[model samples]
Target chain A: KSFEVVFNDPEKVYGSGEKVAGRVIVEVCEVTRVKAVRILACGVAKVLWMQGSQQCKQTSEYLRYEDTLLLEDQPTGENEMVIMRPGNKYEYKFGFELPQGPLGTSFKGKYGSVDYWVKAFLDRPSQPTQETKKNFEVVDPDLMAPVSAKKEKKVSSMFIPDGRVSVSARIDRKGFCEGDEISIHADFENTSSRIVVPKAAIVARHTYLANGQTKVLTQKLSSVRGNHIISGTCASWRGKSLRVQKGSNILRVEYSLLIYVSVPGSKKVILDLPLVIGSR
Target chain B: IKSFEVVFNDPEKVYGSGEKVAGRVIVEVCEVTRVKAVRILACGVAKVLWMQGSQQCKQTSEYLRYEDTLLLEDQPTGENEMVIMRPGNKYEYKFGFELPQGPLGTSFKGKYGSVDYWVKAFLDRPSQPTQETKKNFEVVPDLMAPVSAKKEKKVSSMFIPDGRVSVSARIDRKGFCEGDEISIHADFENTSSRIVVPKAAIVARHTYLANGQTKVLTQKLSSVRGNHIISGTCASWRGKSLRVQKINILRVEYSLLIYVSVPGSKKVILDLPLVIGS
Candidate 1:
């Protein structure tokens, strides 16, 4: 005998609060006797790692459901699960209404994981239970909102032997959806005798501050470099657009525009600006 | 079972917003098959998803920018409303539609979500499974005359605990095409107790949120890590050929960030600007 679970929609990708339905199939090769049959809906999150000398582990359950399809002893004799013929198949249907709120999408990560599954169990009178499981994914709605922002910063130092250098930047708007273009405007002035190079970039920041822990991930999304700036020469930057992405996230995600000048012997001068990403 | 396929007129599968999309749907039936109706559909969809709650829940959202029936073929006659696809016969239908002035987002794939555009053809049957085929494509911004913008900022951190650090930067241009190189000239002065280290340039995409907040897509571009500057020293650097590539609807921009490895010291950054074309 063999058992399998299949989703109504094999794509298995659904939005939050959506209905998930599937069926469990049982194949019988010969005459068989069984005790019971059941189906279960389940979700789990697990994290285990060594932080310093202590082992840290955490597990969370988001959803669970159990339904019995057949039992050995039933009030009605015909309803009892006692016998089956060969070369035949049987199927049972199951469904669930997913919970609302900040649901995480399905993910597989190093050292930890979050998974959702639909399982079917067949109990044998004097043997171990036979089970089969299938997995699905859910997504958050907030990812579709519109996002945008604008900010600026300037840095100056007096410890250098030469005069001070300065850089400034401006973004056109604050809110944008995926696939929208972003415009940046910038300028720089070098008052010192040494050579200087202005640089530009887009940065994604991920902060995990959940479950009594703190972890951060930072990635550079894109960037471009410029030519050298001669002493006492002020340069103007006519900028271009950079594309946004579904930056990987577990807790918090953020983005910023950084503009700065690097001098050979001194600390680079920098400016930071903010940007947003979301659905429309 | 019958075999079905969809093919786009433009093999490159590239089109700017407001342009026309042309394609054909093809199906081959070696044996007679019954169908209720045959239809062609063109669609543009955007999806954003991420794992939250430690895998307990997945937050996902989907948007249809454009969805329309491009073609349809029903039963052949009034007396026999049941349509039968002939054996050893081949069928093909042409489809054409003009894209709107882009509420059509760009095609993109990310860790959490994606925005995609495609055309599909399907044969709906009364008592059997539906036969279908799909073809994916790319949507881009319309070409426009290049324009430029430039600005400069100067700040001195004398009152802050990080001590005094002065810097200056300049960009040569504001607007650029894909594959163009950007030129940046910059100089820095460090008077703080901690050493200053120059990192990489970051290109970030800002998406607007309905909640009045924004999300950013960031990536590290061309970077030059220079020797750490000890207290009371100054030098200059130049970076050339900073490359730019085209992405979907994301508004593109650039900036620079500086890092310091001193224990217990805050990470300091500088932002500049660059723009790329569609």
Candidate 2:
């Protein structure tokens, strides 16, 4: 059980072949390492893009555990003399068993990524091989669904038509989990003469399809404003609380929960709902 | 003294807009010389380049320009019109132009620059050094959208972690008209510990942003990798398949990279949105 994530959190999250125990605390202000202390628990994914003169690298490797830590954890064949001094601080105890299959979750914004790591090598003997690092996380599974919307508009002055404005918004499910809080319900009708400003936003549609061409990015992360309706007015939104934001894909991030009504002259009576923001 | 030329009466000199670009100016006069007029010039352009490090940025856009004279000795009959070209003569002269309704733009030839449409044939020799020829033409003036993706990732962040690997994928539409065959339907589940390698790739990014400094050109097409699913297991694609740009500034894009390489973490990507109307 170990799931520390971020600040290189470790000591809990484990599954599959599960069983991950640890201890490697070496603290010495100005001094050195006697000899052995090398180990590695890997998970790697790499992807790159740069095509002007070749370089579209790609790599994939899931899990492989190697040892040493004076063999208390394990790799290279022989060697002895493992200790430290300067201020005195050394502890090495480790264990492992992971690789049950299926894993991936944690990414760097772009250029593709994946990293589940643990590497420490201070094996010395005329050396210059100092290495240390830790970065782990993988969890991609989870969802909810439902949606509703409607719209209509027609108001005029000179050309004379003088009336018409409508809506019927809703939200019961379209999956949400980031900071969850998206409850909306609407019903409006303004016999047109002006004054109908009801609006909401949670729009993020970034779709970049680069070569055959297509570049799009629209962000309204979060927006809300519902107060006025004067002209034979009407309005409502039962659980109107929106708090969600996070985004992905060669970049295909989409989220829509836009309910609108701005009507002053023409155009603006939209309703679009489609969302999925996971991970609890 | 040579065979100067420019011939294209729809010999695939592709055009679109207000069409009608007839052509002809073939010649072969092994000896006589002294001709003075026989022209044809047509160009449609779009150029962009950026060196950025030491400075060298350029941009050009010109729809089209044409000049035609087929064969003339400067007119005016007098002085016997001078035109003299005999020895085994073989001339053709004929030219017409019509192409402007275009909001035109679509014809690229690489790097950080190029979008040409040409026709140049000359021989204005009152004596010589001007008897050249050139040719290049191909202009294409141009889809639906439907793609699906359901991705969840939470393999292990540490404290009792390991449970998050679910995917839902699809591709039936999103514009595909160049050697089609992209049908992918997927579903997978794995409680996590690295042993999931499900891959699908198709990237064609060609970007260039001038002054701001940028350059990208990648194309890893038609790819697929399967088999390696092991953890309380579950996987599918009943029917998996693979098979799958640019601006004058150099912007041609296409993406559909499905990933599931949870080796160390951060490889459970699922993106959808692609177009290759080439």
Candidate 3:
């Protein structure tokens, strides 16, 4: 069975409260039997993973915006199931309303996932059901923003050979929607007796605490190496931005900005700050 | 009657975690028609949700992490104070307050949840809906860390009643770029009565949406029942290398997840963080 669903929008990027119009096409080489045909448009977040000995799985169907275009049982002769013949083609038009409430932008993750799709399926009594699936992107225009902000930290610790080091970090904003730049500003003063190099990174801390068990997972989202600061000297950094993602609560996920002043031999001085990652 | 807008001294309207936000609220009365007080309010909120259901049994649940406060209240006497109407007059109030080192939820809107923050100016009337206007800002955790100049980790655990399974794992260097062979070596010792089924694997983690979900893939691993480290035996699993490449999404990192299954007991798993360059 050759089945396909095509949307009118070439880019397939849509906004909330918009109409998604598409057509379901199916072609057959020979005559075939049909029972009932219908279409489904749904938004779901399916999570399946293993956290240590515990199995983490959940199905969140946040949106159920569905419509059935054609039903075989309809009294209209055109809606009745008739034998499909060779060299024959069938086409059905359909439309659905994207939810007015918040909808997750299209995302694919290894263990868990949030997805939106439109499907066309034929329910056959003698055998199994045959279906076709299509996906579209839903972006919230309200979440879009220009990132242009800065964060500065001043430290005067006694652990270093010298007395103080002041560091400035910059980003567009504290909260960022998915696919936005998480730029970091790196400029600092080095008053220590030794040379210190600046290092920056975006780290994600994923914690899974359930049934008296806790598993903490960490990963460096992105990192950069800054110019070296010689003792009693000041150094400037031309910063960079790493594209960032949105936040979630299905499992505890948090992020932090890490900046370090590294000396060759002694312990490095660290400055850590928390960050909010979410959709616009 | 004329206009009302909140202007911030810091046009950027940005702030660091735990840092005090300083600004001013400007209220313009084109024609004063109010008989109540004017107050400024700030709030932080987070909404968490995940739902699953069919057409009939639609099961839905939600969680709220919210906070609100009065930044500046004109009537501080705990009682409403009526004021005379004034036309073409401007009311300006300088305000400063510390954002709760928060649970001050960040600003977010997702299919399943959201976290948002806003500052509102309310003109309260004796029996009205309280005319209000608000501005939203982002609040993120201000976290930073020192650079890691080196890598050092050891994996050892007791899996049996008296016997111990110790495995020391290491990487070839501090960092490796794409297509570079990442060589990891492991040596194990079994000193217990139970048979030890040993395996070595390189696990890669991919986090998406703002750290909302983490997907871990065991990119490479030893064959099942491939390495049998008998009691009182010493063995090494070597020649394990991975060819790294750029994968889509936020970021990627490799780690070693070593495991030894003890007959009649739970398996012992050890994790060692790895570094990837380029």
The candidate that wins on lDDT is: 2
RMSD of each: 36.7, 29.9, 29.8
Candidate 1 stretches greater than 4 Å from native:
A1-15, A18-280, B1-168, B174-179, B202-221, B238-263, B271-278
TM-score of chain A for each candidate?
A: 0.45, 0.28, 0.44
TM-score of 2: 0.21
Residue range A1-280, candidate 1, lDDT tens digits: 6788878998867776577887777778877776766777766655455433544444444444455553211212122455655675666666765544345556677535678888888887788998888888766512223332222223334554457677777666544444555656667778776788877666655543321122334556666677899877888677556665442214444566666677655456766665544433
CA deviation > 4 Å runs, candidate 2: A1-280, B1-26, B29-142, B148-166, B170-188, B194-204, B207-251, B256-273, B276-278
Tens-digit lDDT string for candidate 3 (A198-264):
7776776554432112223455676668767886787766547767643232344456667667654
Candidate 3, superposed: residue stretches over 4 Å from native = A1-280, B1-161, B210-226, B238-240, B245-248
The model with the greater lDDT, 1 or 2, is 2
Task: Provide DockQ values for all models, in the order shown.
Answer: 0.01, 0.01, 0.01
User: On residues A1-280, what C-alpha lDDT tens digit does candidate 2 reach at each position?
Assistant: 1111122237555555455666666666555545766667776555454333444444444555566553321111134254354554456766655443344445664555777777777666799767777765665311234587787877765544768788888777776665668988888888888888887878764544332222334556777898899888777778788898542113334567878787754557777776655443
Error of 3 at A20 (Å): 34
Q: What is the TM-score of chain B alone in each candidate?
A: 0.41, 0.30, 0.40
